[model samples]
Target: MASESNGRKVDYSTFLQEVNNDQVREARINGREINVTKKDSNRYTTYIPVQDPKLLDNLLTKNVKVVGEPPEEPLEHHHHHH
Candidate 1:
């Protein structure tokens, strides 16, 4: 199923087909969502969901680094520090 995150829509099948899955080095799973970074020239990032057991297992078996939920935005500066 196609999904959207940060206003970007992703189709897992097509995305996976276009990239070399073996190059994926970082994987993050928070709830049903997954994000991965590939170790390629572009160092692209892909987002998928954990709705499929097979796909999730494939990433885990590859020893991809797992991380907690990513910050929605970079930390901002607050000028009022005491």
Candidate 2:
């Protein structure tokens, strides 16, 4: 009977197992995602880089190939000798 309005307590590994297949699981624990990763895997904790939102995007890609847009714009280098 704790107040989870700030966050949630997960079963640790099961969350990753279930979330491995389902993408929206990102929406489930969310910010707590970083917290669970500490208990889920040791390296995943290093991946946190001491509390960062970018780390959220990092895990999503490692786990989902998920959100966070890419740098797609490219410039053309024209030659004058044509």
Candidate 3:
């Protein structure tokens, strides 16, 4: 979903700017506000209370694949929050 040129790092700011603009436009059309936050690595987690959550969930599930080295036992972790 990201375009990288050779060994250069991807420009996230420009990408985010475009996405935010599109989200705002979609929100206007749907009469709601769409918010998104970037997480570890290239993940972009979006939140839209007035919209259908399954849309994003389904898209994520469908995109996940076994192309890479499959994690052992699906992996597990605990995040300690202060």
Candidate 4:
């Protein structure tokens, strides 16, 4: 399931079920979340578009780990403005 639309939020859990992989799931985008499906014995590849590719390139040099949920900043807009 792939689509590009504004104000569209796909539930990662639902996407995980579709792909038969719960170990890896998320969304992609600065504010959007994307998940990757896990494979048997290889590193999973997830492609996410970054507004500044340079930042992503720099990040590749650092070590990262999953600790907990990302800090939730207030989303200052309604789902659908009336």
Candidate 5:
């Protein structure tokens, strides 16, 4: 078994953030986590679990177009001893 279908997850997460910044939202893109920043209004940040390949590709400039998610390990904290 593996942890991938077409590619990595960073892209999807990254896409969600970018769209959130764009100040808008979509349909096929389901699931969400609201992120309110310096405002009194309610904004829904939906991080859809899965999206169609063509649907994703419409916005995905490249197949491996994920820049990166910044909330990961600092430098070398992922040391899992056996």
Candidate 6:
């Protein structure tokens, strides 16, 4: 399925029905778990959390081109004044 969030377009329509059919790589991005798999050939699909990291060192270690921009940080409301 393809959807858009935070002005970013995401696509999860890639077929991964069979095990080992694709090379799945997992890593922690900004403390969030994400996976990148080769759909076919040079094409790849990255499954990231709603809020993920900007870079994946694991992918770099494996020579996978890191795609997808970092998600925007959530708003933090500081409580001041008693």
Q: Which candidate is the best by TM-score?
A: 1
What are the per-residue Cα lDDT tens digits for candidate 4 across 1-82?
6444433343543433434433333223333344332333222333334334343333233322222244464664566543
lDDT of 6 by residue, 1-82 (tens): 6433322232433322312233434322323323443434323333544542223343465554444444564454445532
Candidate order by lDDT, decreasing, is: 1, 2, 5, 6, 4, 3
In order, what lDDT does every prediction score?
Answer: 0.55, 0.39, 0.32, 0.35, 0.38, 0.37
Runs with alpha carbons beyond 4 Å of true place in candidate 3 = 1-40, 53-57, 65-82
Q: What CA root-mean-square deviation does each model show from the true structure?
A: 8.5, 13.1, 13.3, 12.9, 12.9, 8.6
lDDT of 1 by residue, 1-82 (tens): 6443433344666455543447666766665555655565333334564466566566666676667674563345555542
What is the TM-score ranking, best to worst? 1, 6, 2, 5, 4, 3
Clashes of each: 0, 0, 0, 8, 1, 0
Better of 3 and 5 by TM-score: 5
Q: Please list the residue runs of candidate 2 whose C-alpha ends up more than 4 Å from where it truly belongs after superposition.
A: 5-8, 27-58, 62-82
What lDDT is obtained when candidate 2 is compared to the true structure?
A: 0.39
Best by lDDT: 1
Task: Give residue 6's error in model 3 in angstroms.
Answer: 25
State every prediction's TM-score relative to the real structure: 0.45, 0.25, 0.19, 0.21, 0.25, 0.28
Clashes of 4: 8
Model 6 lDDT-worst window of ten: 13-22
Which pairs of residues clash in candidate 3, taking residues 3 or more apart in a chain or in different chains? none
